[PDB]
């Protein structure tokens, strides 16, 4: 019973991305990892492969397996006819053995000789190609409707796609319900990641995916009437009424401060739900957030080791003949400046396996994938100085252990024959980074720090400071903007957005010393013409170029090239979203960001490329017009430092 | 459906210009990239090897791998009867992979020996010939007619074949139309590059290909009619009558200056461009450039470090058993006055594998094709302070760092033969790196057109052409407007600002007095052709050039006015075809350079166009003049010569 969804995962989204996977005589095994969503369960699976053995292999002394989670679902052997040609084969795969996390790992065999046949040859292969892929449609099941497995119907740690969660309104919300949304939105985005946060919201409509419904008690939404009154903030999860296999969480309050109390509770004491229609009364805060501080970023008040950059079992140690590269990834925050130019400096403590004798077996450190440093293997407290010339937002430190076994092969008329022997690599979760050697300086006009980690708002993981204009009677357009850019930037960080500021006149942003947030159209008291470009007045623009534009800029911008030359003035047709950051008048500090669009098409594509992120990534400079052709970025404007020192 | 065009492109000028790739036990990894250009699909992907294995190769233990993609499109087996002996193979590549770049790699998997084979040794090879191309056609689709793609319906950068533009009028341009179109050419040029722009000129006929067609509400193309009159310089993006496949940009307007504005809108304002019937209604400036800023030259007010001499995120790192040379193209101008052989310091900081023993392995410094200096990679990095003499830069040269390495592999003992796998070594060169050029004087002789054919000194050294007047005869006609309208594009595309500012005039009347460069495109004016200064001058079937008394093929970096003295001033007369280009110092200014494209019959304006469209012929110019015939460009250096600059 319920809805079936016919899934196709291609082989290109689900491997690793060099796009296919080569099964030599010492890396066999080729993994692939999937998951289930925990309500539903798979049925009808089967496994196509379409690969190309090597010619030189043997027709029944070489085959291939299919394991599942240590289970061997077929074994097929490469006939003498398709030793060379393109061979395709489907294998139905046994829904039994299936789990929440599985991985199939296929093994390769294979012998092109017989009596001197020696490993690590490239003579035999087998290769399977990105055309490939998992053919499975999932049943979906009813939940037992218990809110104890929050947020499991709406969003389970097991899933890989994006997690789409609409959220119904009662039209037209005002500050409070706003508010309560973004902070909803914001606490879904940072348990979800980086699977991806979309919010879709709709008025009086009831949506086909698990929702939340806000209420008041008095703007009521539809299909709603018939509940009665609360006396308190209550937290219930009902079934839709049309098709029950969809849950919707409705969230009451006696006004949009019960609301906006029982969001706080639900991103915060959600760790002690239980049953159904949960009664939150009382959430308060002991002390504030110190700033920069964020789960997923690394922490710079003490020296972090690598035991608090796992995130995983057995990351930090590898097996087999060719051990896999060691990658920990640092999420560092894109405010770093150091004027000492003598670069970060760790203390690494690896160990590994003795060689018998030394035939300059190494391990290469890199770090964005690029060659940092290179170490014999001749276990060390090593003191490495990265030099700081790609620390951005994001990056990923590797250790790749490069050995090559000199085996003997014995004499022209005696070839001997036995099986290599693996080892063993482990760094250990005991070498420490520093990172207090930095300041938090730098010029920022530009939206690449917003784009990858959300710096200006971001600074406080809560949002503290942080002011978000939004229009009278805002449509759903607007709504959606605002719930996806504050989910993302939760997501960027570690903490929800729970101390945000939503409001909807100018008046408030005279005097505060908070950064500016624009969603819907820059107010009368901002667009003063100086610092601002791309002025969209729905019929036509204006782009000021900055005398020029160079890829690959210096580490410290110049001012001389910054600078801008003209001002191309255009009425158009079409739909267009432009994304501004500038300074914020009133403090030298804050900044601005301006997110607007020009017609519902420009809304929606901006919705689209703020959800994304491979359109998000590829953003820099202090402008980025997005039209339908694609994002374009520029870096125009006056220059302003952020930060002491 | 649509036109579908066949191409088979060979391995001759896809492959490094060697053409020949052998592939051994060093580098066994053969590249062949092509681009897509995003708007026509490929329908056949037909590849055609013509390959030589090696006599010792095992037949069946031996093999050819073809990726597409990193997917293996097909493997070609060795067979004993074609051990030593050359052999032909086809190979159906799959289209359902093609991208907008694709990288053909071929690899060669080699054994000789079952008990032990010598890894890297010289027996294992398999070549394969520079006649061995991939036959392909291209299928056009129909295009979304939108602005906001735009420039890529017209010009793609992932072609590599020379973007043809021909640009429409209604017969008879004036001199705003003229400036226009010059502006278009110009940008169109700056956007292409080293692609090499052809800007053919039609009158009042249609093509068949992408074109940009010009209107002023008045004197239209006569194809544009029943189009509504407009009141401002909108832009419109419409089909082609004839078939709907190929488009047309109509440049729309009210009169002359609503084309200039349109232009300088196209140039500077293409980034907000959406949706068809783009109207413009305002471009002005805020600030002028500054001498010596190109967007494509290095900067001198500072030293540049190799961040900025990129075009590219891979470029200065390299992997594999031997890691290939790592080239930065960096185009300096060629005003530098170095002439005191001080040379460019540069602190160059490489980081590179430590070998595990002192083995000879360095690294090796060159500038085009020279060796500047070698540094051994067993010193216990570094910023290197290297000096390179300015006695060999020229305007587009390059640096080339390689990193050869004596990777000592054991073979074991004379009974024992220990066989493995050869590590591999990677090397980078960082973007910490900087060379600087702040510390140098503009000051040069300018008698000579090698700088004018390269980088297009005289008139780009400003970047939009300010104080530049190019002089036009009355009427032209279309091989006068296509020569102006190449020659500004190639200037454009030299530089990377396209010529806004240019000043463009059908009479000599404004060049009188006047600060600012004269080119000469048609015929030069009665006033100018007083001076004595006119080496060659190419008149109705009577040509008269003079000759320097001597001529070196390797001048030296010091100009010598009795190396080039003018004798012997010969005169002479016949029927055949010829252009000529000189260049030579303006009677009004004392410090400015008239340079003159002359030609008198079709067939001479089509050698011109022939030769300064391409690069490979204008790399031939040099000296004071060039004349252009059937045989090619013959340069000499005759005449007075004049410092211009600056100290």
Same mark, same amino acid.
């Given at each position: 019973?319920?809805?079936?969804?016919?899934? %196709?995962? #291609?082989? *290109? &989204?689900?491997?690793?991305? /060099?796009?296919?996977?080569?099964?030599?005589?010492?890396?066999?095994?080729?993994?692939?990892?999937?998951?289930?969503?925990?309500?539903?369960?798979?049925?009808?699976?089967?496994?196509?492969?379409?690969?190309?053995?090597?010619?030189?292999?043997?027709?029944?002394?070489?085959?291939?397996?299919?394991?599942?989670?240590?289970?061997?679902?077929?074994?097929?052997?490469?006939?003498?006819?398709?030793?060379? %040609?393109? #061979?395709? *084969? &489907?294998?139905?795969?046994? /829904?039994?053995?299936?789990?929440?996390?599985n991985r199939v790992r296929l093994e390769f065999v294979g012998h092109y000789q017989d009596v001197?046949?020696?490993?690590?040859?490239?003579?035999?292969?087998?290769?399977?190609?990105?055309?490939?892929?998992?053919?499975?449609?999932?049943?979906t099941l009813n939940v037992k409707n218990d809110?104890?497995?929050?947020?499991?119907?709406?969003?389970?740690?097991?899933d890989n796609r994006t997690n789409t969660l609409p959220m119904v309104f009662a039209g037209a919300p005002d500050v409070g319900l706003q508010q309560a949304s973004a902070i909803v939105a914001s606490w879904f985005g940072s348990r979800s990641g980086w699977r991806g946060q979309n919010f879709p919201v709709l008025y009086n409509q009831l949506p086909d995916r698990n929702a939340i419904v806000f209420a008041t008690n008095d703007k009521r939404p539809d299909f709603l009437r018939d509940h009665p009154a609360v006396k308190a903030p209550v937290i219930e999860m009902i079934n839709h009424p049309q098709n029950p296999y969809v849950k919707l969480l409705v969230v009451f309050g006696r006004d949009d401060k019960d609301?906006?109390?029982?969001?706080?509770?639900?991103?915060?004491?959600?760790?002690?739900?239980?049953?159904?229609?949960?009664?939150?009364?009382?959430?308060?805060?002991?002390?504030?957030?110190?700033?920069?501080?964020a789960p997923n970023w690394v922490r710079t008040d003490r020296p972090v080791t690598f035991g608090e950059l796992k995130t995983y079992e057995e990351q930090l140690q590898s097996s087999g003949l060719e051990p896999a590269a060691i990658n920990v990834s640092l999420n560092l925050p894109p405010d770093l400046y150091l004027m000492r130019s003598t670069g970060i400096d760790m203390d690494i403590n690896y160990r590994y396996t003795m060689p018998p004798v030394k035939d300059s077996s190494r391990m290469d450190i890199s770090l964005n994938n690029q060659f940092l440093q290179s170490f014999n293997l001749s276990d060390?407290?090593?003191?490495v100085s990265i030099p700081a010339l790609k620390l951005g937002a994001t990056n990923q430190l590797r250790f790749d252990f490069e050995y090559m076994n000199p085996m003997?092969?014995?004499?022209?008329?005696?070839?001997?024959?036995?099986?290599?022997?693996?080892?063993?690599?482990?760094?250990?979760?005991?070498?420490?980074?520093?990172?207090?050697?930095?300041?938090?300086?730098?010029?920022?006009?530009?939206?690449?720090?917003?784009?990858?980690?959300?710096?200006?708002f971001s600074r406080m993981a809560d949002l503290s400071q942080t002011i978000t204009v939004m229009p009278k009677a805002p449509n759903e357009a607007q709504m959606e903007t605002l719930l996806n850019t504050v989910g993302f930037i939760g997501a960027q960080t570690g903490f929800p957005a729970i101390n945000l500021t939503v409001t909807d006149d100018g008046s408030t942003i005279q005097g505060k010393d908070a950064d500016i947030m624009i969603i819907g159209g820059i107010p009368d008291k901002l667009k003063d013409d100086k610092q601002i470009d791309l002025l969209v007045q729905a019929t036509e623009s204006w782009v000021k170029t900055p005398m020029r534009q160079t890829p690959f800029p210096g580490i410290v911008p110049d001012e001389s090239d910054r600078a801008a030359e003209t001002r191309s003035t255009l009425t158009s047709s079409g739909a267009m979203a432009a994304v501004i950051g500038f300074q914020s008048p009133y403090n030298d500090q804050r900044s601005v960001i301006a997110l607007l669009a020009d017609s519902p098409r420009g809304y929606e594509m901006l919705n689209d490329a703020v959800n994304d992120s491979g359109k998000r990534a590829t953003m820099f400079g202090s402008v980025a017009v997005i039209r339908e052709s694609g994002i374009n970025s520029l870096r125009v404007g006056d220059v302003y430092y952020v930060g002491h020192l």
């Amino acid at each position: 019973n319920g809805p079936s969804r016919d899934v %196709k995962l #291609t082989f *290109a &989204q689900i491997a690793p991305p /060099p796009g296919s996977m080569v099964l030599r005589g010492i890396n066999p095994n080729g993994s692939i990892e999937f998951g289930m969503r925990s309500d539903e369960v798979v049925t009808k699976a089967m496994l196509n492969l379409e690969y190309t053995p090597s010619p030189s292999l043997l027709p029944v002394q070489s085959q291939l397996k299919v394991y599942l989670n240590d289970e061997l679902m077929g074994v097929l052997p490469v006939t003498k006819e398709q030793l060379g %040609k393109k #061979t395709l *084969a &489907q294998m139905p795969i046994n /829904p039994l053995f299936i789990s929440d996390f599985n991985r199939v790992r296929l093994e390769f065999v294979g012998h092109y000789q017989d009596v001197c046949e020696k490993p690590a040859s490239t003579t035999l292969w087998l290769d399977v190609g990105r055309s490939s892929g998992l053919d499975l449609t999932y049943q979906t099941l009813n939940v037992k409707n218990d809110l104890s497995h929050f947020p499991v119907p709406f969003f389970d740690p097991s899933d890989n796609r994006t997690n789409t969660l609409p959220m119904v309104f009662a039209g037209a919300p005002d500050v409070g319900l706003q508010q309560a949304s973004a902070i909803v939105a914001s606490w879904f985005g940072s348990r979800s990641g980086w699977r991806g946060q979309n919010f879709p919201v709709l008025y009086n409509q009831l949506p086909d995916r698990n929702a939340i419904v806000f209420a008041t008690n008095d703007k009521r939404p539809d299909f709603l009437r018939d509940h009665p009154a609360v006396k308190a903030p209550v937290i219930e999860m009902i079934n839709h009424p049309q098709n029950p296999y969809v849950k919707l969480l409705v969230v009451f309050g006696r006004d949009d401060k019960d609301l906006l109390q029982a969001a706080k509770g639900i991103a915060q004491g959600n760790i002690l739900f239980r049953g159904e229609s949960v009664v939150v009364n009382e959430v308060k805060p002991l002390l504030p957030r110190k700033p920069y501080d964020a789960p997923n970023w690394v922490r710079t008040d003490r020296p972090v080791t690598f035991g608090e950059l796992k995130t995983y079992e057995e990351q930090l140690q590898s097996s087999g003949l060719e051990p896999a590269a060691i990658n920990v990834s640092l999420n560092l925050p894109p405010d770093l400046y150091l004027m000492r130019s003598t670069g970060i400096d760790m203390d690494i403590n690896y160990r590994y396996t003795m060689p018998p004798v030394k035939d300059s077996s190494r391990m290469d450190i890199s770090l964005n994938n690029q060659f940092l440093q290179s170490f014999n293997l001749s276990d060390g407290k090593t003191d490495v100085s990265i030099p700081a010339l790609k620390l951005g937002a994001t990056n990923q430190l590797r250790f790749d252990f490069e050995y090559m076994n000199p085996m003997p092969g014995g004499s022209v008329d005696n070839c001997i024959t036995f099986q290599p022997v693996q080892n063993h690599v482990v760094i250990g979760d005991d070498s420490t980074i520093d990172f207090s050697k930095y300041y938090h300086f730098i010029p920022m006009p530009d939206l690449r720090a917003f784009a990858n980690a959300g710096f200006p708002f971001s600074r406080m993981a809560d949002l503290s400071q942080t002011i978000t204009v939004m229009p009278k009677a805002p449509n759903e357009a607007q709504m959606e903007t605002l719930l996806n850019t504050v989910g993302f930037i939760g997501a960027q960080t570690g903490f929800p957005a729970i101390n945000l500021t939503v409001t909807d006149d100018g008046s408030t942003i005279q005097g505060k010393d908070a950064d500016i947030m624009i969603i819907g159209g820059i107010p009368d008291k901002l667009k003063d013409d100086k610092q601002i470009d791309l002025l969209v007045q729905a019929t036509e623009s204006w782009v000021k170029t900055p005398m020029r534009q160079t890829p690959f800029p210096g580490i410290v911008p110049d001012e001389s090239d910054r600078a801008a030359e003209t001002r191309s003035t255009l009425t158009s047709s079409g739909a267009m979203a432009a994304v501004i950051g500038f300074q914020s008048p009133y403090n030298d500090q804050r900044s601005v960001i301006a997110l607007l669009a020009d017609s519902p098409r420009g809304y929606e594509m901006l919705n689209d490329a703020v959800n994304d992120s491979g359109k998000r990534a590829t953003m820099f400079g202090s402008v980025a017009v997005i039209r339908e052709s694609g994002i374009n970025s520029l870096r125009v404007g006056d220059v302003y430092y952020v930060g002491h020192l």
